[PDB]
RNA sequence: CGCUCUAAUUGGAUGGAAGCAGGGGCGAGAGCUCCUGUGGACCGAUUAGUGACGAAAAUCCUGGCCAUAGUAGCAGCGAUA
RNA sequence: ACCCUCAGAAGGGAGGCGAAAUAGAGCAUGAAAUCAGUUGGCGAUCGAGCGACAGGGCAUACAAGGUCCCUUGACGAAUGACCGAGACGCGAGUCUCCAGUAAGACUCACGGGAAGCCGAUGUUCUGUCGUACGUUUUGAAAAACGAGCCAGGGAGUGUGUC
C-alpha cells in the first residue's frame, strides 16, 4: 500500500493542469508523482529459489 | 631547476609500413563529432549519442547538413583501431606486476589515475628499466 | 553570503562589505557600475547628490518605463535611488574608516572593485482576488568594495 | 568627387542590360567601374510599354517602402544591383565599387564594351534613359 | 555499452578514494580512459549472478530558477485631510 | 579574545583557533538552471532551427595530444592535355601524330622552416546544405497537439496454467 494511502483525485480538464490525482494541491499516488506508488516493485510473492 | 618527465617520453614504436600507413590514414581522415541531434538547441539534451528515432527527424532521414548518423562504414582500420596517436598499443597499469609481459617496443603503459605517488614512483622507475614508455609520467624538478 | 571575488594586496588595499541588505538589487548594480573607478571621496559626494536629487544614476539595464534624464551623458534613462545610495554610503564610510585605521588616506583611494550580489529573498505573500495569494518578496543584497592606493 | 575607376564605360547608345551584366561581372572580379553618360543609355522596345513598367515601379510601395529611382543615374545603378548579391559581403563590396554618372566627369572618354552598342540606323524601337526619367517626372539636370 | 547489490578470483587509496569543474587521448557508437584543480574517504577489474537498471517529451511529478519588471496594485467608495 | 568602525549583542575591517573557516552555525561535498564582476571573440548598414561538413581571422602557461608548412625528388588508380605538324569544316570547331605522354589523389625520402607552431579548444568570417524535437497524420516548419528553463523523480512486473 505504499503510496496508495490517499484519497487524491484528479480535477480533470478545466484548470490548465495535467490530469493527475491531487490531494491538498499536491500530486499523489501515480508512479510519476513524488510520493506516488512504485509501478513494478520487488514482490514478496516472487519465487527466488 | 626545471621540470622534466620521468621515463622514455620520446620513445616511438616500430610499426610495419602498412600499419604506419593505416595509422596516418586514421589521422588524416578522422571522423564527424557524432554528437546527438539538436544537443546544441537544448541544455537538457546532452552531447552523448542517441539514434534519431523521430519519424520526421531530418537527421534520421539523412538530410544533408543535419549531421552524419552512426554507421559501420565509419569504423577505423582494424590494424590500427584503438592505438594511441603515437602508434603504441596501450596497456592499463595498476602496479609493478602489471608491467610484466609488456613489450616496450610495441606497447606503452598508462598508470591508472587511482594509483598514488608512492606506487607511481616504483612503477615509473621499473618501467623505464624495462624500456617501456609511461604515457602519463610524473614531472620532477630536475 | 559572498567572498571577495577579486584578489587584493593587503599592503596597498582596503576592503568592506554589506550583508543581506534589504534594498533594490537592480538599483545596486546601477550604483556600483557608476561609482567604480572613482575616488572614495568622489563617490561619497556623488551619492549625496543622488540622494539630494541633483545627480541621476544611469539605468542602463533595468530601465523599463524609466524617464530620460538630461544630466545623463552617453545614455538616457536614469533615477535617484536614495535607499541603495544610503547603504553604499555606509559601505564607503566603513571602507574609508578601515583604510584610515590602516594608515592610508581613505578618501583619496580609488574604488578598484565594487559589485552587488543577490544573496536571497525575504519571502512574502500578498493575498489576491479569487481566494488566491501570490509572491511579495524583498531582495537581499551583499556588496563588496576594494579600495586601492592611486 | 573623384573615383579611381580601373574602367570607365561609355553607356551612350548602349543596351543598359548588356552593359550592366558586364559591369556586374567585372565588379565581382575586383574592378572599380564607372558608367558614364547614363542619360544616353538605351533600352529596346515599345516606349509605351517600357514606360508603363517603370511608372508601375514608382507607384508601387507602402510603409515598409519600395524606393525606386527616377533619374537615369539611379535607374542604371539599380539595374546593376539586381545583377549582384548586394546583401552579401562580396556583393555589397562589388556594388559599392561601381558608380554611374550623368554625362562624363572624367577627362578620358569611356570605352565601349563589346556587344552592347546599338545601331541607330538599324533601330527605331528603343528609348533613352533620359527620356524615361523625363516621363517619370525627374528634373532634367543633364 | 552503462547502472545497483551478491559471489569467486584479483587490484587501487591519506605519497589522496568517490564526486564535481575545466582540459588531453581512444571507440562508428552506447561509452572507456588520462591530466590539472577541488574534494577528504572510500573505490574498482574479470567471471558468474541480481534487478524499484538508462528520459527531451506524458496540459507528466517535486524542488529550484530567469525573463516578464523596478512593471500592475499601494487613486476611484458622498468619509478627498 | 582584543582593537577599529557603527545608532548597534547587527554587519564590516583587522585579528585569534584548526590540517582545513571557500569546515563559522540549515556550517561534508557543493552539479545545472541562473546572477554579479571580469576575460577572449563578435558588435550600433543589417536577417531569423541557432548547426553539420570545408576553409580562413583573432585567442591559448604546464600537464594529459605532436604534429605541421615550403623547394626538389620517388611512386603514381581512374582521368588526361597545351604547343607544334599534317589533314578537314560555310562556321563555332573537329580528326591524325606528338601520347595514354606532361599532368594526376595518397604515401614516402633528401634539404629547409614553424612551437600559438600542428592538432585541439573558445569565438567569429566565408562556402555548401539546412523551415527544431517528439507525437497525431495520406500529408507537420506548420495557423494540428506538448513543453518557460534546469536538476532529481517518472512506464513489460508477480503468481498460476498453457
Ligand atoms: Cl563492428
Ligand atoms: Cl532583483
Ligand atoms: Cl514607397
Ligand atoms: Cl544578396
Ligand atoms: Cl526598330
Ligand atoms: Cl595512403
Ligand atoms: Cl517489453
Ligand atoms: Mg514512496
Ligand atoms: Mg545541450
Ligand atoms: Mg514610465
Ligand atoms: Mg475570500
Ligand atoms: Mg577473475
Ligand atoms: Mg521519447
Ligand atoms: Mg514547476
Ligand atoms: Mg510591460
Ligand atoms: Mg476635504
Ligand atoms: Mg557545505
Ligand atoms: Mg486529416
Ligand atoms: Mg533521471
Ligand atoms: Na494518508
Ligand atoms: Na517468495
Ligand atoms: Na536595457
Ligand atoms: Na547629458
Ligand atoms: Na543623455
Ligand atoms: Na529591353
Ligand atoms: Na516605388
Ligand atoms: Na502546465
Ligand atoms: Na576558427
Ligand atoms: Na499527438
Ligand atoms: Na513536428
Ligand atoms: Na500551417
Ligand atoms: Na512561469
Ligand atoms: Na523503470
Swiss-Prot record, chain A:
Subunit composition and interactions: Part of the 50S ribosomal subunit. Interacts weakly with proteins L18e, L24 and L37e. Has been cross-linked to L18e.
Record-stated family: Belongs to the universal ribosomal protein uL4 family.
Described function: One of the primary rRNA binding proteins, this protein initially binds near the 5'-end of the 23S rRNA. It is important during the early stages of 50S assembly.
Positions spanned in the full protein: 51 to 99 of 246
Region of interest called Disordered, as start-end residue ranges on this chain: 1-49
Signal peptide: none
Record-given protein name: Large ribosomal subunit protein uL4
Species lineage: Archaea, Methanobacteriati, Methanobacteriota, Stenosarchaea group, Halobacteria
Organism: Haloarcula marismortui (strain ATCC 43049 / DSM 3752 / JCM 8966 / VKM B-1809)
Compositionally biased residues, Basic and acidic residues: 42-49
From Swiss-Prot, chain B:
GO CC annotation terms, alphabetical: cytosolic large ribosomal subunit
Amino acid composition bias (Basic and acidic residues), ranges on this chain: 8-21
Signal peptide: none
UniProtKB keywords: Ribonucleoprotein, Ribosomal protein, RNA-binding, rRNA-binding
Keyword rRNA-binding listed: yes
Swiss-Prot/TrEMBL GO biological process terms: DNA repair; translation
MF (Gene Ontology): DNA binding; nucleotide binding; rRNA binding; structural constituent of ribosome
Bias (Basic residues) ranges: 38-64
Disordered: annotated segments: 1-87
Record carries keyword Chaperone: no
Assembly with partners or alone: Part of the 50S ribosomal subunit. Interacts weakly with protein L15.
Family: Belongs to the eukaryotic ribosomal protein eL32 family.
Function, in words: Binds to the 23S rRNA.
Name under which the protein is recorded: Large ribosomal subunit protein eL32
UniProtKB/Swiss-Prot annotation, chain C:
Organism of origin: Haloarcula marismortui (strain ATCC 43049 / DSM 3752 / JCM 8966 / VKM B-1809)
Subunit structure: Part of the 50S ribosomal subunit. Contacts the macrolide antibiotic tylosin in the polypeptide exit tunnel.
Protein name stated in the entry: Large ribosomal subunit protein uL22
SUPFAM superfamilies according to UniProt: Ribosomal protein L22
InterPro entries in UniProt: Ribosomal_uL22, Ribosomal_uL22_CS, Ribosomal_uL22_euk/arc, Ribosomal_uL22_sf
Any GO BP annotation: cytoplasmic translation
4Fe-4S found in the keyword field: no
UniProt keyword terms in alphabetical order: Ribonucleoprotein, Ribosomal protein, RNA-binding, rRNA-binding
Disulfide bonds: none
Family in the record: Belongs to the universal ribosomal protein uL22 family.
Pfam family, one: Ribosomal_L22
Keyword Ribosomal protein among record annotations: yes
Entry GO terms, CC: cytosolic large ribosomal subunit
Secretion signal, residue range per the UniProt entry: none
One MF annotation (Gene Ontology) recorded for this entry: structural constituent of ribosome
Function statement: This protein binds specifically to 23S rRNA. It makes multiple contacts with different domains of the 23S rRNA in the assembled 50S subunit and ribosome. Contacts all 6 domains of the 23S rRNA, helping stabilize their relative orientation. An extended beta-hairpin in the C-terminus forms part of the polypeptide exit tunnel, in which it helps forms a bend with protein L4, while most of the rest of the protein is located at the polypeptide exit tunnel on the outside of the subunit.
Gene: rpl22
From Swiss-Prot, chain D:
GO cellular component terms listed in the entry, alphabetical order: cytosolic large ribosomal subunit
GO molecular function: mRNA binding; rRNA binding; structural constituent of ribosome
GO annotation terms (biological process): negative regulation of translation; translation
Domain of life of the native organism: Archaea
Disulfide bond sites: none
Keyword annotations: Ribonucleoprotein, Ribosomal protein, RNA-binding, rRNA-binding
Pfam families named among the record's database cross-references: Ribosomal_L13
Ribonucleoprotein recorded as keyword: yes
InterPro entries noted in UniProt: Ribosomal_uL13 (IPR005822), Ribosomal_uL13_bac-type (IPR005823), Ribosomal_uL13_CS (IPR023563), Ribosomal_uL13_euk/arc (IPR005755), Ribosomal_uL13_sf (IPR036899)
Keyword Ribonucleoprotein in record: yes
Family: Belongs to the universal ribosomal protein uL13 family.
Subunit details: Part of the 50S ribosomal subunit. Interacts weakly with proteins L3 and L6.
Record function comment: This protein is one of the early assembly proteins of the 50S ribosomal subunit. Binds to 23S rRNA.
Protein's name according to its UniProt entry: Large ribosomal subunit protein uL13
Organism: Haloarcula marismortui (strain ATCC 43049 / DSM 3752 / JCM 8966 / VKM B-1809)
Amino acid at each position: 500500500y505504499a503510496g496508495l494511502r490517499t484519497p487524491a483525485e484528479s480535477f480533470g480538464s478545466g484548470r490548465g493542469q495535467a490530469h493527475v490525482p491531487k490531494q491538498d494541491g499536491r500530486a499523489r499516488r501515480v508512479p510519476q508523482a513524488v510520493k506516488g506508488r512504485s509501478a513494478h516493485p520487488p514482490k514478496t510473492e516472487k519465487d527466488r529459489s | 631547476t626545471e621540470l622534466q618527465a620521468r621515463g622514455l617520453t620520446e620513445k616511438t614504436p616500430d610499426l610495419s609500413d602498412e600499419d604506419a600507413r593505416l595509422l596516418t590514414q586514421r589521422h588524416r581522415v578522422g571522423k564527424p563529432q557524432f554528437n546527438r541531434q539538436d544537443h546544441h538547441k537544448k541544455k537538457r539534451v546532452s552531447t552523448s549519442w542517441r539514434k534519431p528515432r523521430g519519424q520526421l527527424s531530418k537527421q534520421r532521414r539523412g538530410i544533408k547538413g543535419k549531421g552524419d548518423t552512426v554507421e559501420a562504414g565509419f569504423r577505423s582500420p582494424t590494424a590500427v583501431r584503438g592505438k594511441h596517436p603515437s602508434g603504441f598499443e596501450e596497456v592499463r597499469v595498476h602496479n609493478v606486476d602489471d608491467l610484466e609481459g609488456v613489450d616496450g617496443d610495441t606497447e606503452a603503459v598508462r598508470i591508472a589515475s587511482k594509483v598514488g605517488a608512492r606506487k607511481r614512483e616504483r612503477i615509473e622507475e621499473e618501467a623505464e628499466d624495462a624500456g617501456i614508455r609511461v604515457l602519463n609520467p610524473t614531472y620532477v624538478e630536475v | 553570503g559572498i567572498s571577495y571575488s577579486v584578489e587584493a594586496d593587503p599592503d596597498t588595499t582596503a576592503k568592506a562589505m554589506l550583508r543581506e541588505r534589504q534594498m533594490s538589487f537592480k538599483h545596486s548594480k546601477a550604483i556600483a557600475r557608476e561609482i567604480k573607478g572613482k575616488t572614495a571621496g568622489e563617490a561619497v559626494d556623488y551619492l549625496e547628490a543622488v540622494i539630494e536629487g541633483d545627480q541621476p544614476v544611469p539605468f542602463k539595464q533595468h530601465n523599463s518605463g524609466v524617464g530620460h534624464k538630461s544630466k545623463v551623458d552617453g545614455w538616457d534613462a536614469g533615477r535617484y535611488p536614495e535607499k541603495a545610495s544610503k547603504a553604499f554610503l555606509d559601505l564607503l564610510e566603513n571602507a574609508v574608516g578601515n583604510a584610515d585605521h590602516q594608515g592610508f588616506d581613505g578618501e583619496a583611494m580609488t574604488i578598484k572593485h565594487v559589485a552587488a550580489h543577490k544573496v536571497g529573498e525575504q519571502q512574502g505573500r500578498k493575498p489576491r482576488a479569487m481566494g488566491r495569494a501570490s509572491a511579495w518578496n524583498s531582495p537581499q543584497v551583499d556588496v563588496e568594495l576594494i579600495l586601492e592606493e592611486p | 568627387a573623384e573615383f579611381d575607376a580601373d574602367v570607365i564605360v561609355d553607356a551612350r547608345d548602349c543596351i543598359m542590360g548588356r552593359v550592366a551584366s558586364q559591369v556586374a561581372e567585372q565588379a565581382l572580379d575586383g574592378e572599380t567601374v564607372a558608367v558614364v553618360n547614363a542619360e544616353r543609355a538605351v533600352i529596346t522596345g515599345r516606349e509605351e510599354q517600357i514606360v508603363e513598367k517603370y511608372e508601375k515601379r514608382v507607384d508601387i510601395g507602402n510603409d515598409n517602402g519600395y524606393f525606386y529611382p527616377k533619374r537615369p543615374d539611379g535607374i542604371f545603378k539599380r539595374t546593376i544591383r539586381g545583377m549582384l548579391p548586394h546583401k552579401k559581403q562580396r556583393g555589397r563590396e562589388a556594388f559599392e565599387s561601381v558608380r554611374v554618372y550623368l554625362g562624363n566627369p572624367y577627362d578620358e572618354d569611356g570605352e565601349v564594351l563589346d556587344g552592347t552598342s546599338l545601331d541607330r540606323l538599324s533601330n527605331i524601337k528603343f528609348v533613352t534613359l533620359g527620356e524615361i526619367s523625363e516621363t517619370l517626372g525627374a528634373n532634367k539636370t543633364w
